[PDB]
Amino acid sequence: SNIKINDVFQRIQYAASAGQTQFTIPFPFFDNEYVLVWQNGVQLVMGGAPGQYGISGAGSPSGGLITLVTPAALNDIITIQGDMPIDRTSIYSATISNLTGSDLNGDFNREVVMMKQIQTTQALLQLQYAPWLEVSQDPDVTKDRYLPLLGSGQVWRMNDSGTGIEAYTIDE
Amino acid sequence: SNIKINDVFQRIQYAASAGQTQFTIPFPFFDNEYVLVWQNGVQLVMGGAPGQYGISGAGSPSGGLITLVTPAALNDIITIQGDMPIDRTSIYSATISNLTGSDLNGDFNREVVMMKQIQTTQALLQLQYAPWLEVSQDPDVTKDRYLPLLGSGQVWRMNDSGTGIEAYTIDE
Amino acid sequence: PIRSISNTFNRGELDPTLFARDDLDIYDKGARKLRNMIALWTGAARIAPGTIYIDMMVDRENGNAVIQDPLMVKGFDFTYDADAEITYTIIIRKSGTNIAFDIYYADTLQTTVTSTAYLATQIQDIHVAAAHDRVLILHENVQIRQLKRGASHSSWSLTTFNPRVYPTYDFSVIGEAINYQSFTFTLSATTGSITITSSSAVFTHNHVGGLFRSLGGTARITAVASTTSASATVLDNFTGTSCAGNLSSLAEKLWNSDTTTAPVSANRGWPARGVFYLNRLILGRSLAVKNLVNLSTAGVYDNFDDADLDGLVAFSVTFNGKGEQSVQSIVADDSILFTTANKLFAQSPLVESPITINNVYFAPQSQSPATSIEAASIDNQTLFVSSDRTKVMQAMYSTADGKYITLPATMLSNSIVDYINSNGTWEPAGISTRLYLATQDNGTMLLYSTLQTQNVAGWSLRTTTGKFRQVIGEGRQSHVIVEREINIGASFEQTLDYAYLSDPTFKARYDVTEFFASSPMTSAIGVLENQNDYILIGNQAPFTALDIDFNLVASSDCQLQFEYLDGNGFWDVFTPTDNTSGFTVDGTITWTFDDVLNWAPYQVNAIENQYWIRIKRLAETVNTAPVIGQVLINTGNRIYLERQSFDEYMDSTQIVTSDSNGLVTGLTHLAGQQVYAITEDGATIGSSFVDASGETSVKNVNTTLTVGMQYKPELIPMPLYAPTQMGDSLYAEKYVQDLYVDYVDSLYLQAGFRPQLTDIPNMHLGNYTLGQSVPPQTGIYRICPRGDWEPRQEFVITQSQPGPMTIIGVGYNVEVA
Amino acid sequence: PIRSISNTFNRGELDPTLFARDDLDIYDKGARKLRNMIALWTGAARIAPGTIYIDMMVDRENGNAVIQDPLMVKGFDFTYDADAEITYTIIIRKSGTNIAFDIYYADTLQTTVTSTAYLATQIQDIHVAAAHDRVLILHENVQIRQLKRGASHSSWSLTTFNPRVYPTYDFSVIGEAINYQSFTFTLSATTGSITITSSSAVFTHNHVGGLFRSLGGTARITAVASTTSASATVLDNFTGTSCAGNLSSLAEKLWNSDTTTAPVSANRGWPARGVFYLNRLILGRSLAVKNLVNLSTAGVYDNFDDADLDGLVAFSVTFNGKGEQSVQSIVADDSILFTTANKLFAQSPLVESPITINNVYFAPQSQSPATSIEAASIDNQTLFVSSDRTKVMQAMYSTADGKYITLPATMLSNSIVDYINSNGTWEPAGISTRLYLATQDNGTMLLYSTLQTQNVAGWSLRTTTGKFRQVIGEGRQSHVIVEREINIGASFEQTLDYAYLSDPTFKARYDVTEFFASSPMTSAIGVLENQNDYILIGNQAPFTALDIDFNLVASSDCQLQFEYLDGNGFWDVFTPTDNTSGFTVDGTITWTFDDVLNWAPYQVNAIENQYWIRIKRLAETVNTAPVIGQVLINTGNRIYLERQSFDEYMDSTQIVTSDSNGLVTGLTHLAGQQVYAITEDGATIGSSFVDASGETSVKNVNTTLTVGMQYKPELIPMPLYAPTQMGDSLYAEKYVQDLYVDYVDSLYLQAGFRPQLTDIPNMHLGNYTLGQSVPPQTGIYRICPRGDWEPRQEFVITQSQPGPMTIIGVGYNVEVA
């Protein structure tokens, strides 16, 4: 994989024009099966039937393309996200064998993309305290960070002692 | 690049003494631009003017040092965090005939630092259920894990059916 | 039916019109393409030798004015001490309206010798005659000069060559003088100092130093008082004082440039060809008599006294056949060979000819017109370019035929031959080849590897990032004169090599190179007529700015989008600073090498090895599409002197040292180019762009490196030939199951069926220590190319980055259907 | 299926770029490697001839100062009585700042002749011209000398060669003298003793003995009073007393070194090349005119009188072509051949040419630059080294071409050719070979076996425990000059040939040879950085001490462990005397040969035939690792004269006798080396180390033995070639079921696929009587090599210990998949 991996989020979202069919994938990907597409919150499937989509650009640094079979209506929300599973993509012999820079590039590029997908979810889709806040720097102190399971009609509420977050029932 | 990467959180916080200017960075970093500094929740700029800071020690396995231009007041909060981009812009040739220890160590080390920055955020700045709680082991069951967007004056609350978290309006 | 076949490359690149000639024994010994490689006499193919940058050709007497006209430069070699390996590369270059000689030794300019005797416009017509210890400078209209080296490398003198006695010729014999056959000459006496009187005007001032022969006597004229009176000194006594004109012989000096001294003479000119042969100096092809050569007195190179007609005296040879026989080259092979405008003149080497006045038997051998490029001697044969310059001719003596036989040495490789403009020879040390080199008008260089007794004759084509203009060498070494482009920053001189307009699908190709190159008032063309149309531009060298003049600007902003094509064939967007504001006003579009970081030469629709950029209109509505008058780019032409070397794998190389940040300076002659860096251990560490100031950054810091440009070798074997019992399978469907690449001392190889090739590894995991450079590798690599079933399919052996390369053969396992 | 194939070796070692050339008839007639063997003109391959120690080159006039510079020694042979087999080996060696001639006969120094006429720095530029009964010593700057033998072996005289009449030359013709073309010469009279006066300064003192020609007359100058006046004796009468300068000819002596006698003359030098051809002496390549040869008067070798221009008089030949044609060698083959810097000059042997002044027909034959190494004549051809010294050229006359044809004799074996620095010929008695030998700069020797009419031409490479510096011989015998190392005890001179740093697994290789070799202030390297790291050191010869200088000592004891590599490839621990105390202080590390008893040459990662030692750090913690500045070993260089012989199977041999304890003394020239002992019956009994005092112990007591060093023969046949019906199968998977080794008169053979070989027995159980030596054996041995399935797999025929060896062929049964 002799491409360079740019610093681009592994998620993009669009509001469709009237009758739009083509949407750009700005982040790199290696397999068509590892790119998820939603339209108004409903995941689509690859194919040529109405309601499906085609995809191109695997292995490219960027500039992939999603082509809807059915043209989108105005203000349809199209979401495109990378979802490559984590695993080894190489195998090296213990006995004396050959090595190429393409082998190393393929391993490191795919591992960088996997890390970017984790960090994209962390940065865009998850909650965190502001980095400058005075949380405990010892992770064993779980007062601010561990959550309980919520029962029916319950919210997360710090208890009156200020020692941990507990599930709290709320009524009118 | 021929350095070890120790197991150190990529974020440090200090309560300044009266007139303190030097604050230690205990974690490795590779470039001065990949370190963020806050003083009382305000992000500082690297430079020589008052209200700014200078930084040294890039590439060192044991971190470096932050030197404030203006001495800090008593109990000022100084936060230092590593924020390297997740990409790969230096790659090998297709058939390399010379692979240096620095190049090979660099590729492995930089990915370890990237993962440590992700893990530092999720260990110190993010919420999670306790590891022993009986959360659904199928990730497709999003009852406890998918959140809705909050409107004005709304909180997260498990619905009456106990099937998902929904936004609930609270006034007074 | 699987058949195992193999292919060697002893015969070089074969013309496509030979591809049905399975009867010849060359079908498995040649290549469809042999580019930037040579054929060794063992049959292997080796990457062509690289070059080392020496100097840039400038007018040193006019403030280092850059020379941009290839006709103003002409070089030649001069070996001064073969055992000490002292060979001088002398460059004749423009110096104002005159010439100068730049003398180089050890890749360094030693001294410059100027001369006002020659014009800058006469440079290409200056020939030399190298002796054991001096060089004669020959021009048909300028008296001979001597260039002789003094007591050091930097001490040189250019003087005039003055014969002891001039040669003589009777120009009335060819109708170029007054006919005196009806005149009567009267002598005052038969001996001593006399006066010769003519009944009619015959004498000219050029008759001073001439001869008068009649009645068995000879007299040398010493003064010409008028057209009818002259004073002469008797050399052999006359038998009488009355001489009939038709029985006499009056000859003037053969060489003369004086046409003003009374009585006025004709411009007879001076010899333009010459060679030193044994103990005589041979000079010929003067301005007035181009089909005549003169041999000096035996043992006295500067004496051409021809008063006597016997012995070791100086004499002349005239070449006549059917038509013009003007002498082109005088070759010191066997007995002297004379290539002319029509016929080759020589005598049989089996004849015991002592080379004297009445013992020379030069005869018209085969018909073989030749041009003014000097003939080459190598590998037991003589090679010379034909008169139309589209062929190289080989001359050898055939005892079975009793004469010299001339035949086209380019007979099997006519397709790659363009018009040839120079040639040289090279016998490099340690390399299994004898080389004949020849540059062409299109900027390429032919390479001919020959070993004729072993039936080795292989042609190949050499290309560079630039244009070869001359090749210099007589066997010991080889230099080239190359025209290259450099980035000139904010100024604009050159035009794009290619320019097309394309449709939204990027499939249409409408060539508009001429419109962009022409001035706005000669040609113009409308561009970006519709939304999503393209402008595709390409150039041999990288460029970082365009300068556009509009005959008609666009009515509104075209919303331009810019992309460049990288080495993987991927088009990538970049954002330049365009001062045209979407082709709405005349101006420049500029970008930095960081915007085009991945830019690399690539192929677009059969146009190969260009730096491509495409511009796309995004605006939906423009009322008036722009019309472009001319486009210029920020590159300018330069002329360099470079030395070819088999230890180099890049072009125009230079040894540099990087600092602690990897910064490299002093690469001004490569400004704007893409260069590769090779370590002293022999590892290519990558490529980078030199900016306009001659600086670049490399990966290795604090390292001594060699930096130069890539010339990409390409080897395409002959079509699969697997004759079965059914007959020749020349047109049968074939599929290659296995492809074997057999290589020696090679790095960075790749092979297979395009577009998806296979890289050949050169690193042994488990037996490699980090930081070391693997040596060049030897072995056999087996590849499944995954090609088609066509009878004439192409497989390629090429190199990903510069380095050593030698392919000794290609094998196949072919399913012949 | 199974195919049976065979391989003989009459084409020698073939270049790896030929391995796809199955169309040539050489694929089954060559070898991949032919080392320390020669190819007989049958198909067989015989072990190369051994050498016998003669003497060590010393400066005998300065207290036997050992000579360690190969440029200070140059030998040549001189046959004095062929029928009595009296051939002298004369060695020119340094003697102070001058030279001396050491004359050897019957392996004994006969006498020494000193000479102050030559400098020690001019030795390599001294050439000889051996006559039937004397040798001329030629140098371009020193007058010719004669070396002639008196009435005994030890009686020799070195005198000056004085011509009766000197040759003359007009140097103004080549611009090296005053140009007199505008002068006027006045004679006092036309006959007898006259005075010649010039209108301008022309004469020099070197004109004494010169000639003046004009007006049909000739005069020999006898005195030069000034630059404008001279006295001469008229040889042929003049017709007048006023001679025009441009019609005259003034010549000075061609050879002269006097530049101080008034009026001062130029240093014209003396001839540097020569040969005796029939009844004339030919001398050429003087200092001033390098492209001219002079032939003496017919029948008078020391007379070069050239006053006359007809008959049997002395005369000159000047060689000119396109450029420098300085004469390199004058060959007495056919009708005389002249190799020059550029072109080969000769006349057709089919021409009935007597060698006289006006009927010599030397013409420029093929282009073929030559170096100063003298050409060799053998096997109906002429062989000479090219100018760049990377090729051997063969010249033969081709009647079909009408000229001499030159082609590379090394065309099929370019890989083993380094830079050649000497050559000789040998036609040994009783051996089916005609040998051309040539040593190289890298220290190897090329061996060329040729039988031209039978298409026998085989190259092979000869290596020794040392470096070949010169080879001497004209066919009757062969000597070599070899540089070898000896153990010098407690002193240190040489550096290690190889040095590496390695990791605990002993797989990493970091080359540090240059750092160990350089002085401490040039470069240094840190060693033993981590626990269990290694230092691997190797040397061509055994050594028993290291001397280490540290730029930075280790902060604490490194707990060093020492091991050496034996002949089985097994590392064994030994305990030296470590005066560095674990690299903590500068000092030496010494050991005895008993500590390294099993030490033998071996291979480590493609480096072959070295004595290896490794040092391992065992200390767990050291704060500061040592940095080594330089390492020296206790060996020193010596230069030996040795005679080659086909009766020897070892190098530098000497006949010795052991006492009752097996002790052998007098082997000082082999001090510190590993040697083998061979009995008179022809049985090799084992190996042992000679200590620094020249003593060693052998197994057999009270025995006369031959003692010398092993040079290991190696024969790797060509790749398997078994064409089938499918195709050539050059790249098919192959497996060798059976390997047949076909040998004649051989001992101690071993063959197979590395690393596990099979020994070939040479002792018949049941038909052997104890104490007897079984004679060299003849037969065929069949072996299952157990190799792999690769198409380029290698099989080796080699020898375990020195002895006779002749391999006449190798057969296979190959499963061709």
Side-chain angles (χ1 to χ4, degrees), chain D residues 191-465:
Chain D
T191 61
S193 298
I194 68 174
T195 299
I196 309 178
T197 303
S198 180
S199 53
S200 187
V202 61
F203 295 112
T204 65
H205 178 253
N206 198 32
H207 280 87
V208 171
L211 294 169
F212 178 77
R213 300 182 179 178
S214 188
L215 305 177
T218 303
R220 184 167 300 277
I221 305 173
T222 55
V224 171
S226 64
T227 57
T228 57
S229 186
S231 304
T233 298
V234 172
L235 308 177
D236 296 320
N237 292 343
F238 296 79
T239 59
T241 57
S242 184
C243 313
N246 69 327
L247 301 179
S248 300
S249 176
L250 180 63
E252 61 190 294
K253 286 185 296 174
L254 179 59
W255 307 322
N256 118 95
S257 56
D258 184 0
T259 61
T260 58
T261 301
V264 292
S265 311
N267 185 26
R268 304 308 192 182
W270 291 88
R273 308 292 185 270
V275 76
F276 288 82
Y277 185 84
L278 295 183
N279 62 342
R280 291 181 191 256
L281 171 61
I282 314 184
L283 294 177
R285 196 209 164 90
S286 66
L287 178 64
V289 194
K290 296 190 180 182
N291 65 330
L292 175 128
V293 301
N294 305 88
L295 297 87
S296 72
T297 307
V300 196
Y301 304 107
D302 64 334
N303 181 21
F304 294 86
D305 187 358
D306 53 12
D308 297 325
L309 303 178
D310 197 10
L312 302 180
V313 301
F315 66 105
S316 302
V317 180
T318 308
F319 306 104
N320 267 308
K322 181 182 179 181
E324 174 176 6
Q325 312 285 336
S326 56
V327 176
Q328 301 295 334
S329 178
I330 314 176
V331 183
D333 278 331
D334 296 359
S335 194
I336 310 170
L337 271 60
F338 300 92
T339 70
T340 79
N342 267 315
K343 218 154 292 186
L344 173 70
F345 290 82
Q347 54 181 328
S348 175
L350 307 177
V351 159
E352 342 81 11
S353 169
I355 314 297
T356 63
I357 170 163
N358 288 293
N359 42 89
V360 288
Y361 313 106
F362 302 110
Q365 316 289 295
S366 53
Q367 164 84 6
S368 192
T371 193
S372 59
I373 307 169
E374 186 175 22
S377 172
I378 186 179
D379 187 66
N380 310 292
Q381 66 196 312
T382 304
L383 302 174
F384 61 94
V385 182
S386 71
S387 64
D388 61 19
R389 307 156 53 216
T390 65
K391 291 172 179 60
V392 178
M393 309 306 301
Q394 163 193 4
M396 291 195 310
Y397 183 80
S398 178
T399 305
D401 297 314
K403 64 182 176 188
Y404 278 85
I405 296 299
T406 53
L407 45 86
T410 52
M411 64 170 177
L412 298 185
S413 313
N414 188 74
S415 55
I416 60 176
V417 173
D418 196 63
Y419 298 86
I420 300 170
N421 59 4
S422 78
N423 62 6
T425 50
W426 193 8
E427 207 136 341
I431 310 299
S432 307
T433 189
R434 290 171 150 174
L435 282 182
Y436 167 88
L437 305 86
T439 63
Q440 313 197 105
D441 290 356
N442 59 7
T444 65
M445 182 167 65
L446 296 166
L447 304 175
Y448 185 46
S449 172
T450 172
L451 211 296
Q452 219 287 329
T453 56
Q454 298 299 314
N455 297 327
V456 168
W459 289 91
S460 57
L461 197 65
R462 172 72 152 94
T463 63
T464 190
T465 310

Side-chain angles (χ1 to χ4, degrees), chain D residues 27 104 272 370 428 535 559 730:
Chain D
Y27 209 92
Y104 293 82
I535 299 178
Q559 303 177 28
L730 201 62

Side-chain angles (χ1 to χ4, degrees), chain D residues 134 576 805:
Chain D
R134 51 170 170 173
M805 174 184 187

